[model samples]
Target: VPKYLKEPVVVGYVQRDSIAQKIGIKPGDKIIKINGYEVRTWEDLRDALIRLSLDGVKETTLFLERNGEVLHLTIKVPNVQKGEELGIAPLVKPVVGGVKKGSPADQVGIKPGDLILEVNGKKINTWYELVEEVRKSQGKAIKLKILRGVAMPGAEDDVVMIEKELIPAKDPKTGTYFIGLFPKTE
Candidate 1:
């Protein structure tokens, strides 16, 4: 199992009055086990929920870990009406080597020699971390902290700190947070 799956999975939240919201789920709540089976991935969660829904299981008893304690929640599985089924859009990484030319990274003065350290106060180390942080922003203006490589005439190395707001793109198919920046690999 992946590191994220080794422990309880806390993917995201469900808002109030919303389908998931009305189900009594919240953010930061780790899903301990689903339907008496251990879930290792979002796919597991989706499959279990779908099976329960199809089996006419109205109420799903979930064992959750809230604040270091175990809690139980009974959520009603609403019928799937055409497109109202559980949608599990698992987070995916995009394919590309580095930043693209004429993209938002270039427009916002980000260069190829800069290292992205943080996005919207979230520490970014791997490509997935950066992508996840950007996705959570939902197209809002995000504060980015970058370290630019110093290029001087015959100089050893110079590092410059730069801060900027990255305005993400929006699309109906994609989520709210999307950034088009690529990190430089040293």
Candidate 2:
């Protein structure tokens, strides 16, 4: 890959004794393809993995580029049914990467790449902080300060700041409150 050809789907972590680690997929490895699917970003890889899991595919072939050398590896996708696994995590930024359709976040116009600046007037810098605030809301409407269209932090560049309030719903399976927002990265 050339200097200007960087597309961001790269492995950030390989859990100890997990499928990725057992198969020799290390951190910083660039993922070029997965089982014939061309994934270029964290969101792309996430969608691909979800589709594969839904299709009942248990095994996958990974095409990787490490230090300018292309290589391939096969691994079985494990789940709680088979025991314990941490699996591979992607490298992604702190931004709104996805929103569930018809959910509160989507209905309120929270979009992909939108940055969450604050929750109920409290400034937050990490995703965990935002989640903690949302969970503390207990499904009530919470004010959100959204920052849009910035290539970097600090809002120094041209950006748009908007405020929106929305109620979060609880996910029955996990018993966690959510506005149907998925983190851009792990």
Candidate 3:
């Protein structure tokens, strides 16, 4: 694989009905420009986003590349410097990064580095989908298809397929129901 992809500033994990979604920013679009700032790399996009949030730009223009074509979009922004709630994040694999101790997922033998393959028999390809489905379970018992021993990359014999059923529990601190499995961020 190449060290870098052709488009470094490709969009990913757009939240439903979010500001980016409202502007028709799809998941695979490559960001070409923000206002007049060129976004050719992740660092460029991050720097431009920080400036956009801190400066409180009421309206901004964006240039996007989707399927080899350019798109122009203008979006409204809140006047208050609330850090520009664009609600978009980078794409992540559905690999478990951490399991909270005493949590339902931990109690069920889910471990860090396990790859979540499916939920309720539905294929799960992204971390966001896994989270959304688990949250929708609403403390109900949910079935999981997990691939264990993924940390030992290339060791096909060590890989194991496991099925587990557990009820998601509500956390008082966040008031959100979760199985206490977190996706790998780094």
Candidate 4:
């Protein structure tokens, strides 16, 4: 791959003892192959994993490059009956920031670094879209898919990302509804 060509997919997090972690996958690693398929994006990776797991595959192979070392890992596929929890959170981009003081967002635990994955179940990739969706709540309770991060002491960029839900609050002083949250400027 050309150095200038963007990586299709990179490892964001690894689940403890899952096929990924057991096979030595780590965050920041670049994915090269999955089940003999070349990975180029999250969609490609997702489809590959789904196809393998749904096809009754018990074990699959994953190839990754981490810190200049190429690696091959074998991941065991859990039965769909059991569950499909990959356990690793993907590294998402551009998180939400500036939760308003005493605002609906603050009351519902919206933090400074919450990665806004969606608004009212629709995926959000732009600030205006996020706000537009948020404005519709009319003081409603929102189901948020958020990723919060914490890291080992020195590695500021190394984050343990987790998803959660937050029920927004409503400031009743005015008739209109709004969450006291602001999108982080990219």
Candidate 5:
């Protein structure tokens, strides 16, 4: 593979109901411009986004390239510095480096270093996949298959399957229900 893709910044994710998604943006779409300023890299995207408020620009005109076609979209931009949320975040690396004390996962004996193999039989290879499964289990059962420490063990492999009806609890600060598995740090 080349060191860098000779293409515009591909959308790794789009927040639900966010301006990007509201304007029909989807993952895999390539961003080409912000307000007519060409953007080919993440740094460009950041530079353009960080300046939206300073430029007093409330509306953002974006151009995207998808499947060899260009599409234009206008979205309401939020001032990033005024505690306004754009509901956008880059896709994160997936791993459980730590477990929150007294959280649902911790209470259920989910330990650090356990790699999630699946949630309810749905393969979970990325943070998005794991989050999606958890999100859909709001009022339902939460089943997990994790690869516990070391390699395949005891001749039966190292996979441990667990089934429970634990519903994620809302945190006071974020108010988002979470299983409380701490994300692996760099």
Candidate 6:
């Protein structure tokens, strides 16, 4: 949500009928300003949202970027603390390295030689991208597209499969949901 937090670039629209949807926000609408302040960093945007006065009137003007055009709109802020408990972080792209032996990926037939291409329809060019895609699918099943081996005399470069199982994560307080795997970057 911060302007400075790049990668996992925000592109999709917020779902209609959802809390954000009720506020007239949409997917593909880039959030450029929050609470009358220009947001240049992810931390900035996060702090502003978190520090909002819960008991006061909940409304703010948001500057949005939509398809190369900028627009301004006023929207009522909905109580999103419950949603925050889900612990979804900005999608950190994945950087594929050697898969851990006996890990879920390996048990699912994913081999070290395979290059991950997509998770649950989200294209992943790096291992971090793959990890982010997996995080979004926690507690759910997801499909994978991989490129295995070089083009051979009679072999295709791609293979697709489904990975089923819950992604592991530890929430010390048990108040937020998280996937256990950390991005290779630490």
Tell me the lDDT of candidate 3: 0.77
lDDT of 6 at 16: 40
Model 6 quality (TM-score): 0.38
Tens digit per residue, CA lDDT, model 1, 64-111: 665457787776666654435432222222222366566566678776
C-alpha lDDT of all candidate models, in order: 0.60, 0.73, 0.77, 0.64, 0.67, 0.51
Clashes per candidate (backbone, < 3 Å): 4, 0, 0, 1, 0, 16
Among these predicted structures, which one has the highest TM-score?
A: 3
- Candidate with top lDDT is 3
lDDT (tens digit, per residue) of candidate 6 on 57-144: 3777767665457777766655556444111134333433455555556566655555555566555434444444555655465566
Ten contiguous residues minimizing lDDT sum, candidate 4: 1-10
For residues 22-66, write the lDDT of model 4, one tens digit per residue: 667665566778787788876676667777888988888888775
Q: Put the candidates in lDDT order, highest first.
A: 3, 2, 5, 4, 1, 6
Candidates 4 and 5 compared by TM-score, better number:
5
User: Cα deviation in Å at residue 169, candidate 2?
Assistant: 0.7
Q: TM-score of every model? A: 0.44, 0.46, 0.55, 0.43, 0.47, 0.38
Q: Per-residue alpha-carbon lDDT of model 2 for 1-186, expressed as tens digits?
A: 332134466665667787788889866577778887896875566566666666778889878886567898885755444453437665433479889999899999999989887788865544655666778888899999998975667656678999999999897767988887877853
Please, what are the lDDT tens digits per residue for candidate 5 over residues 1-186? 432244346665678877777888765466778895778876677677778867889887888875457888886776777756555445344568887899888888887777776677655435665565566666455777776654655565455555544567666766666687766755
Q: Which pairs of residues clash in candidate 2, taking residues 3 or more apart in a chain or in different chains?
A: none
Worst 10 residues of 1 by lDDT: 87-96
RMSD of every prediction:
8.8, 12.8, 7.6, 13.7, 8.5, 10.3
Candidate 5: misplaced stretches above 4 Å? Answer: 1-12, 15-91, 151-165
Q: lDDT at 124 for candidate 1?
A: 42
